[PDB]
């Protein structure tokens, strides 16, 4: 996915929120 | 009812947070 | 040893393996976090290595993430913080007028008293497209507040109504606008909509995606946006928004694959759906593309020789009055003296020296008096474009003489031109002409809604907002700036269909354009430095945090400092004695 | 807003 | 517009064609 | 090419002599 968050892999699925 | 729980969004009533991010 | 001013050069060039190869090898990191402004400014990012002596730094001012919270401190220096209501300033129509003036006021203040913790109940008042509008609009009230701003969106973004989450999608984009966050928030947050089945929501994706990112040419924006032109389920509206985002990322690029996507898009077309308005916006994200390379044009000249001959013409004169905007040159205004857009680039390419500009000024006089009744339409908007944020009292003059014609579009390009020629200037004369024009055109629904927008883009920002494209003593031009502007003005070469019917959010464009227009000092430390100044135009005494307006020049009233750039103008490094 | 002149920004009334 | 404002120096008035001669 | 004086202006095909088309100069 080009639209997702793993927070922010340096400090999910945004549509779905699954 | 600024936040959404784990989902979902009583605002929105959205049904299926750290604010607005993924986590 | 002076690379401010040679970064300044290059700058104009645009030649930026020239501007690279001179931000390196400054050794002095102050120097060179004052062209960092300078860059931030002009809408330049340059990636350098984590290896450079302040790496970290250099990139936060790059940024501009500091932006909005130097900003606020100069809006609490005012004490202008309170919201303004659109009655203030004073159907379907009225509330959509109040919702782009309460945009347009409250802009880059992010309070507002219509969209309050429950916007509801004020998206609900609007209906279909006005509701998009309405939930754009508060993406330009918390503009460059990445954090706060996608923390109130959000809630938008789980809506049922899908004209509302097209609006969240859009103003997700608008707040990222010029703030280049390294997060990429908004290519997560909008990216799986590009194709979505609703061609709505595509819509607002694509603006929202070509807003965010229309600095750099990003080549995984692109590839993401470019297939949507193709696609058979996109509509002519959802190619052409295509069309201007993939110009607006890749603006002045060259991009290739650009290029070539766009040219294939008319090719495929055809010659029954060339005549759709929409399809104008095919050749100015093309036009977008090559926006002042010049004699380069040639080869993609000869290349739409093949396409129909009405449409043609139009793509034609658009193209080659992009490639040549910030010439001023004297050869191609007399071949411009598809009429539209003709007299739409004298303006484009006259704005970029004075004595050319002043030609034009009377040429669009003498055609507003006695041109051809087609031809006047546009003759208004050029207007604008020469002379944005800069209330000259001819100018006006004129503008208010023909926001009375019996022809509704020369009256409704007349009033918006007037709104955009005073935009960012609380000046009274002009306010007061707009509401005297507001008393004479009631129960007139169209040129009433002209009348608001230029009201309310009079008191953008409440005072403090520029549009100019122009910045540096003058002498830069900003081709974000200019894209927007063009988006904004070619579409209103259509205005009674495409502004007066569905597709009114794309006056969202100007968000492009929106700049600060306040002097700021600081020491070498980022830190606020009050220094009393001496504004002139070439005057009173001012200290600093002070506005500039369009034509004036500031110079430092004691010698007890020395700055680190020659021009006064936006932020300023300050050297102890 | 009302006027204020040190920083040379101009208001407009309500004001 | 009726036409009092500024014409400039086209003089009856002749300020436009789209205006009253 | 001229207009005649309501107002007739075929050149333009507008309807609301002239010495100059071009200004209109009485």
Same mark, same amino acid.
């Given at each position: 996915?080009?639209?997702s968050?793993v927070?922010?892999?340096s400090s999910?699925?945004?549509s779905?929120?699954? | 009812? *600024? ?9 929105? *009533?959205?049904? %299926?947070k750290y604010?607005?991010?993924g986590? | 040893?002076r690379?401010?001013?040679?970064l ?12 690279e ?11 060179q976090?004052?062209?960092?402004? /300078? ?11 984590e ?8 990139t ?9 919270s130097?900003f ?6 005012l ?14 129509? /009225? ?9 347009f ?17 004020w998206? %609900?008042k609007?209906?279909?497209?006005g509701?998009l509008?309405?939930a754009?609009?508060?993406?330009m ?13 959000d ?9 509302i ?11 990222n ?6 997060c990429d ?7 799986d909509?590009?194709?979505h ?17 229309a ?14 032109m193709?696609?058979?389920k996109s509509?002519?509206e ?14 002045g690029?060259?991009?290739g694959?650009?290029?070539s996507?766009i ?6 077309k ?8 929409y399809?104008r916006?095919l050749?100015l994200?093309?036009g ?7 004699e380069?044009?040639?080869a993609?000249?000869?290349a ?13 004169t658009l193209?080659?009055?992009?490639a040549?905007?910030g ?16 007299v ?8 970029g020296?004075?004595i050319?500009?002043? /030609? ?8 507003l ?31 208010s003489?023909?926001?009375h014609?019996a022809?509704?579009?020369?009256s409704?390009?007349?009033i918006?031109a007037?709104? /955009? ?11 007061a ?5 507001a ?9 009433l ?18 549009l100019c494209?122009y ?5 830069l ?23 007066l019917g569905?597709?009114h ?17 600081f020491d070498?430390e980022?830190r606020?430095?009050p ?15 002070v ?6 020049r ?11 750039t ?6 300023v ?5 | ?6 920083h ?8």
């Amino acid at each position: 996915s080009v639209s997702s968050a793993v927070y922010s892999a340096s400090s999910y699925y945004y549509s779905s929120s699954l | 009812s *600024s936040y959404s729980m784990h989902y979902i969004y009583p605002y929105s *009533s959205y049904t %299926y947070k750290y604010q607005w991010r993924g986590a | 040893s002076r690379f401010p001013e040679a970064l300044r050069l290059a700058l104009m060039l645009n030649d930026m393996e020239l501007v690279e190869d001179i931000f390196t090898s400054c050794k002095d990191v102050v120097v060179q976090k004052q062209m960092a402004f /300078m860059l931030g400014r002009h809408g330049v990012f340059l990636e350098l290595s984590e290896d450079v002596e302040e790496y970290e730094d250099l990139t936060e001012i790059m940024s501009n993430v500091q932006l909005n919270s130097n900003f606020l401190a100069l809006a609490r220096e005012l004490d202008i913080m309170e919201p303004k209501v659109p009655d203030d300033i004073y159907s379907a129509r /009225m509330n959509l007028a109040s919702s782009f003036v309460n945009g347009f006021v409250n802009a880059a203040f992010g309070q507002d008293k219509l969209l309050t913790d429950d916007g509801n109940k004020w998206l %609900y008042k609007n209906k279909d497209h006005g509701m998009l509008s309405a939930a754009a609009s508060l993406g330009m009230i918390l503009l460059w507040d990445v954090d706060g701003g996608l923390t109130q969106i959000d809630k938008y973004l789980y809506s049922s109504e899908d004209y509302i989450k097209s609006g969240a999608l859009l103003a997700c984009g608008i707040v990222n606008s010029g703030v280049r966050n390294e997060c990429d928030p908004a290519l997560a947050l909008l990216s799986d909509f590009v194709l979505h089945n609703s061609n709505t929501m595509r819509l607002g994706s694509i603006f929202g995606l070509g807003l965010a990112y229309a600095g750099s040419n990003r080549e995984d924006v692109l590839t993401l946006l470019l297939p949507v032109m193709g696609d058979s389920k996109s509509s002519m509206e959802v190619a052409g928004v295509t069309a201007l985002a993939c110009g607006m990322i890749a603006v002045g690029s060259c991009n290739g694959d650009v290029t070539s996507t766009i040219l294939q898009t008319i090719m495929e077309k055809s010659e029954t759906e060339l005549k759709d308005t929409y399809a104008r916006w095919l050749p100015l994200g093309l036009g977008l593309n090559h926006l002042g390379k010049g004699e380069a044009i040639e080869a993609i000249l000869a290349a739409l020789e093949v396409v129909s001959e009405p449409f043609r013409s139009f793509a034609n004169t658009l193209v080659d009055v992009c490639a040549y905007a910030g010439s001023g040159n004297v050869l191609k205004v007399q071949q411009l003296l598809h009429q539209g857009v003709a007299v739409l680039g004298i303006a484009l390419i006259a704005m970029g020296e004075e004595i050319g500009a002043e /030609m034009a000024l009377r040429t669009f006089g003498h055609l507003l008096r006695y041109g051809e009744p087609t031809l006047r339409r546009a003759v208004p908007l050029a207007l604008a474009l020469i002379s944005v944020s800069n209330p000259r009292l001819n100018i006006l003059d004129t503008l208010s003489k023909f926001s009375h014609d019996a022809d509704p579009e020369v009256s409704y390009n007349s009033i918006f031109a007037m709104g /955009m020629v005073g935009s960012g200037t609380n000046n009274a004369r002009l306010a007061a002409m707009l509401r005297q024009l507001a008393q004479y055109h009631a129960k007139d629904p169209n040129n009433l809604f002209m009348v608001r927008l230029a009201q309310g883009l009079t008191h953008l920002g409440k005072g403090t907002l520029t549009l100019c494209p122009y910045h540096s003593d003058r002498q830069l031009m900003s081709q974000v700036a200019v894209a927007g502007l063009l988006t904004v003005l070619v579409s209103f070469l259509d205005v009674r269909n495409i502004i007066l019917g569905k597709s009114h959010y794309v006056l969202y464009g100007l968000v492009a354009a929106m700049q600060p227009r306040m002097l700021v000092t600081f020491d070498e430390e980022l830190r606020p430095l009050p220094v009393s100044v001496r504004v002139g135009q070439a005057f009173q005494t001012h200290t600093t945090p002070v506005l500039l307006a369009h034509g004036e020049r500031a110079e430092l009233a004691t010698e007890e400092f020395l700055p680190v750039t020659p021009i006064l103008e936006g932020f300023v490094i300050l050297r102890k004695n | 807003f009302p006027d204020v002149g040190l920083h040379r920004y101009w208001g407009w009334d309500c004001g």
